[PDB]
């Protein structure tokens, strides 16, 4: 057997020990991994093919292999006794000495020169804008009480999902570019991928929970106020985050959280299990996009039919807001002007509905800022649409569609997925006039 085929063999049996149940399954995997380690030792590397068999370049690899074999001897003594958790720890210790020592004259490192300066620039820009912008969102919602109670408590949850990915995984990815390879341990590798999982899936379900809250506030607005919202929304934020952790646990069993050299980041692997990836593309993308697309379609048909809209008085300038109503004149909050009985008159000048003109302009701050949150969703869809397509193609047939996907296309798609983390406060400033004022309020306070 060739050295290239043996490099895969002992690496494939190492993944078996991680998903093993008893010590006999570990002992059977350690026997195959030791025979492959002896075989790869009695083979010249393709990279150092020019280097002589006695010369000091190939002589260091021959002495380096015996260090890894002795580590299997220490691991098999634990496996004979019946220790699985102790032998799995010894297997991870041999895995670190198999990518640092053994991977010297081995590797298909044919990555184009543009992936390193782009990824890193995107990563610097994203991490810098995220830690500042999303922090200002947290600050503006915690300060402004009128904005917080306007269903923007979910924004704290979404901004924390965006922030957490900039503090732990993004900087480690940047170190993995400059040092060329994952410079941190396997425990730091699996965790970085998991943190990114919470940030991605958590953002999907936070956007959907917002689409439901903004669907119920415009459509079935009467029913909305009848149902409590005091303690309901902090409970929903807790539930959607626990659902995310539950959805991320099968990664620990399948073993899909490993280092990807293509994008220099320790992330989720699409080829590990085509059954679990299919569930991530459908249940955690295709389905939640479909329920949100319906939510905003029902809102847009109301705006198009000129339904829930502000009506201003052509006598004393009284602006009737459907979100406010007219409670002292019987109009309970959340009532459309087209539904108020014809006997109703202005509660300021007493002129009838006859002389009432609507605002033929929808502002992005109106109806709990429905337009901004819509833009937020469309932006999210754009960033994660190609990556979910790659994961969909591999799930169908990985035997022919996995090598068919270009390496350049994967980096281009993963660059967008990362960049989404800093884009959310940018759209709050440009579209939401109330957030814009609050951004200036905090920035002027930090100055003076």
Q: Which residues bind Zn ion (CB under 5 A)?
A: 313, 315-316, 318, 346, 348-349
CA distance 24 to 78: 11
Residue located via tokens 């699985």: 84
Nearer to ligand JEV by C-beta: 371 or 387? 387
Cα angle: 181, vertex 184, 190; to 5 degrees: 95
**Spatial contact of 105 and 45, defined as CB atoms under 8 Å apart:** yes
Nearer Cβ to Zn ion (349/443): 349
Taking CB within 5 to 8 Å according to partner kind, which of Zn ion, ligand JEV, none is near residue 17?
Answer: none
CB closer to ligand JEV, 86 vs 260:
260
Distance of CA 180 to the CA centre of its chain: 24
Kindly state the smallest distance separating residue 345's Cβ from Zn ion, in Å. Answer: 9
Which of 359/389 has CB closer to ligand JEV?
A: 389
Contact criterion met (CB below 8 Å) for 211 and 296: yes
Say which entry of Zn ion, ligand JEV, none residue 197 contacts (CB below 5 to 8 A, set by partner kind): ligand JEV
319 contact partners, CB below 8 Å, separation of at least 6: 310, 311, 312, 313, 359
The smaller minimum CB distance to Zn ion, of residues 89 and 315, is found at: 315
Closest to ligand JEV by CB, 264 or 268: 268
Q: Which stretches of the chain bind ligand JEV, using CB under 6 A?
A: 193, 196-197, 200, 248, 251, 267-268, 270, 277, 280-281, 387-388, 391
Compute the least distance from the CB of residue 209 to ligand JEV, in Å: 18
- Around Cβ 320, how many Cβ atoms within 10 Å? 23
Q: What is the smallest separation between the CB atom of 199 and ligand JEV, expressed in angstroms?
A: 8
Q: Sign of dihedral through CA atoms 247, 285, 380, 322?
A: negative
- Which whole-number Å values give the CA distances from 354 to 335, 336, 351, 357, in the listed order? 18, 15, 8, 9
**CA proximity to 419, closest of 128, 137, 217, 189:** 128
In the complex, minimum distance from the CB of residue 388 to ligand JEV, in angstroms, rounded to a whole number: 5
Beta-carbon contacts of 4 under 8 Å, excluding residues fewer than 6 positions away, are 46, 106
Judged by beta carbon distances under 5 to 8 A according to partner kind, the member of Zn ion, ligand JEV, none in contact with residue 154 is: none
Residue 127 touches which member of Zn ion, ligand JEV, none, C-beta under 5-8 Å by kind: none
Give the nearest distance from C-beta 346 to Zn ion in angstroms: 3
- Binds 348, which of ligand JEV, Zn ion, none (CB < 5 to 8 A, cut-off by type)? Zn ion
Instruction: Write down the least CB distance from residue 160 to ligand JEV, Å.
Output: 17
**Nearest residue to the partner ligand JEV, using Cβ:** 391
Strand pairing category for 319-320 and 265-268: unpaired
Q: How far is the CB of 384 from ligand JEV (least distance, A)?
A: 7
What minimum distance in Å lies between the beta carbon of 281 and ligand JEV? 5
Closer CB to Zn ion, 266 or 313, in the complex = 313
**SS3 state of residue 368:** helix
Q: How far is the CB of 267 from ligand JEV (least distance, A)?
A: 5
Distance CA 272, CA 192 (A): 18
Q: What is d(CA 406, CA 124) in angstroms, rounded to the nearest whole number? A: 25
Task: Name the binder of 313 from ligand JEV, Zn ion, none, CB < 5-8 A by kind.
Answer: Zn ion
193 binds, among Zn ion, ligand JEV, none (CB under 5 to 8 A by kind): ligand JEV
**Residue 315 interface partner, choices Zn ion, ligand JEV, none, CB cut-off 5-8 Å depending on type:** Zn ion
- What tokens does 317 get? 């300038």
Place of tokens 């169908």: 396
b/e sequence 159-184, b meaning 16+ C-beta within 10 Å: bbbbbbbbeebbebbbebbeeeebee
The partner in contact with residue 200, picked from ligand JEV, Zn ion, none with C-beta cut-offs of 5 to 8 angstroms by kind, is ligand JEV
Radius of gyration of the chain (CA): 29
């Amino acid at each position: 057997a060739d050295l290239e085929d043996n490099w895969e063999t002992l690496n494939d049996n190492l993944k078996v020990i991680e998903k093993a149940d008893n010590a006999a399954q570990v002992k059977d995997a350690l026997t195959k991994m030791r025979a492959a380690a002896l075989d790869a030792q009695k083979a010249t590397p393709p990279k150092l093919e020019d280097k002589s068999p006695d010369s000091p370049e190939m002589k260091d690899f021959r002495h380096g292999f015996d260090i890894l074999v002795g580590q299997i001897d220490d691991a098999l003594k634990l496996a004979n006794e019946g220790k699985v958790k102790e032998a799995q720890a010894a297997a991870e210790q041999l895995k670190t000495t198999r990518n640092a020592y053994i991977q010297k004259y081995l590797g298909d490192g044919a990555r184009p020169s543009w992936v390193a300066p782009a990824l890193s620039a995107v990563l610097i820009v994203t991490t810098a804008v995220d830690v500042v912008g999303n922090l200002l969102v947290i600050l503006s919602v915690l300060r402004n009480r009128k904005l917080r109670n306007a269903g923007n408590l979910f924004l704290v949850s979404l901004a924390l999902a965006n922030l957490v990915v900039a503090f732990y995984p993004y900087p480690l990815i940047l170190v993995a570019i400059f040092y060329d390879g994952w410079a941190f341990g396997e425990e730091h590798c699996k965790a970085s991928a998991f943190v990114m999982g919470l940030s991605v899936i958590g953002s999907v379900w936070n956007i959907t929970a917002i689409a439901i809250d903004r669907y119920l506030y415009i459509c079935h607005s009467m029913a909305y106020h009848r149902i409590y919202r005091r303690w309901h929304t902090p409970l929903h934020i807790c539930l959607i985050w626990l659902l995310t952790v539950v959805a991320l646990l099968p990664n620990f069993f399948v073993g899909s959280l490993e280092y990807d050299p293509r994008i220099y980041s320790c992330t989720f692997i699409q080829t590990a299990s085509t059954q679990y990836t299919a569930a991530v593309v459908v249940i955690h993308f295709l389905l939640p996009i479909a329920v949100v697309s319906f939510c905003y379609l029902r809102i847009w048909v109301l705006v198009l039919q000129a339904r829930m809209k502000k009506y201003t008085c052509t006598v004393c300038g009284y602006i009737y807001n459907p979100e406010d109503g007219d409670p002292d004149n019987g109009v309970n909050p959340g009532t459309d002007f087209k539904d108020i009985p014809d006997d109703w008159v202005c509660p300021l000048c007493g002129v009838g509905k006859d002389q009432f003109e609507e605002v033929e302009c929808l502002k992005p701050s109106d109806l709990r800022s429905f337009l901004t949150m819509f833009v937020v969703f469309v932006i999210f869809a754009i960033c994660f649409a190609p990556l979910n397509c790659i994961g969909l193609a591999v799930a169908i047939n990985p035997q022919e569609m996995a090598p068919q996907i270009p390496e350049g296309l994967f980096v281009t798609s993963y660059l967008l997925a990362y960049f989404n983390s800093c884009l959310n406060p940018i759209v709050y400033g440009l579209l939401d006039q109330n957030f814009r004022r609050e951004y200036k309020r905090i920035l002027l306070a930090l100055w003076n």
